């Protein structure tokens, strides 16, 4: 009942499909999420991975995929919604 976007930059080495759609597998109770991971080289965006992610309170009830981490090496977000990893943005924690 939950579907995400798939991406693997190491598509050739791992002999996996580069990009596409992924049907998730969870449980009757288990909430499912979509993850997205990328790089930011002072503006330029380099993709890393995208796909299914398991029940995590860090992703609970978050409609949008937003990286809350400030100035990290590998930017990451997760969200709870069908294809919500379609796009991502960065916005640090207010604090």
């Amino acid at each position, epitope marked *: *009942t939950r579907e995400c*976007i798939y991406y693997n930059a190491n598509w050739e080495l791992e002999r996996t499909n580069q*990009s*596409g759609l992924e049907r998730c597998e969870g449980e009757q109770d288990k909430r499912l999420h979509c993850y997205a991971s990328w790089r930011n080289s002072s503006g330029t965006i380099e993709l890393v991975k995208k796909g299914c992610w398991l029940d995590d309170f860090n992703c609970y009830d978050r409609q949008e995929c937003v990286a809350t981490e400030e100035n990290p090496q590998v930017y990451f977000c997760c969200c709870e*919604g*069908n*294809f919500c990893n*379609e*796009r991502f*943005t960065h916005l640090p924690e207010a604090g």
Partner: antibody
Amino acid sequence: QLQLQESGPGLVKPSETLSLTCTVSGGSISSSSYYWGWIRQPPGKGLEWIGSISYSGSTYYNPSLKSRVTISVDTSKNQFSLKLSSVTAADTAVYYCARDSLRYGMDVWGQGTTVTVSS
Amino acid sequence: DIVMTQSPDSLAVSLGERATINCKSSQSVLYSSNNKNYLAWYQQKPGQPPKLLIYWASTRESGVPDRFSGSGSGTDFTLTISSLQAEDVAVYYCQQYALAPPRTFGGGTKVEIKR
């Protein structure tokens, strides 16, 4: 704030080929979306989906125009182009580029370019 | 190729009164996601591109007033303007963003004011 801008000739000779390009500000083509599409609207007529593409180059076209339509993707300059061969007077229309999203619809649109096919 | 059909072609309604436009699809656009109703409604004024009004056939996009309400399910849907206002004079379209992709648009319904 996502902004889309089309670029290309407003005039095209008949039987030739039409080329337009959508440039993206606010976000990249890899982030900010998956599919990016092209739409066209003839004068005083309804909207017609041309095609759409992804940041990998996964191309999907309208059945009526699969013959001549060609979408490109340039991850470097935040662009995606449209090329339509063997133009006719029926291809005189306003062309728009839009963010084709799975959830939601056509989120953001460009202001469109009026392309006239004439000698 | 999920064919879309809109009705009527034009509307003339006095300001304050309600407006109603219908959109019928040649295949039910529901999906096992339960979000179902993969339909969108857009408002286009003369010089401008279409402005997204409603997605999921029910939910609104930010900034769109309460006077606009989407409805329906399966194959039949409706867009309803509870109280037509002067700034609402436009041509409204419906579109299916169903996964299987002949991405089809409706005909368009021009709303007008009786003044």
